[PDB]
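Hey, sorry to bother you again with one of my protein questions. A protein chain has come my way and I'm curious about its shape. It would help a lot if you went through both lines with me. I owe you a coffee for this, so here goes:
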Amino acid sequence: KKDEHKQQGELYMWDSIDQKWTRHYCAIADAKLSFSDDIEQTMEEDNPLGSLCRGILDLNTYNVVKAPQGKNQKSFVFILEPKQQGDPPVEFATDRVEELFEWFQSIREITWKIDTK
């Protein structure tokens, strides 16, 4: 028995702004991943726009790499490496082994693997 369904939830991304791990509302649609701004750890100084889609990963020009021993107070981290030209990388992390293999395997399902013919 198997059932396909959109993978949506929360994730963590390295924030050099405050050098810490905040909570972001992620959601994969079609072949892209959109993460929203802090939903509780908001650092709005003057309460800017905020909006919903703070950023999206085309997942068509990146590379996933399982970072060992995690990064920055982490033990399990994954880094995205753009393939466009000279774009910056992005670090991700979780608090469980299941959430890690679940969210990161999906990100890889679009980047690490690409079926086009």
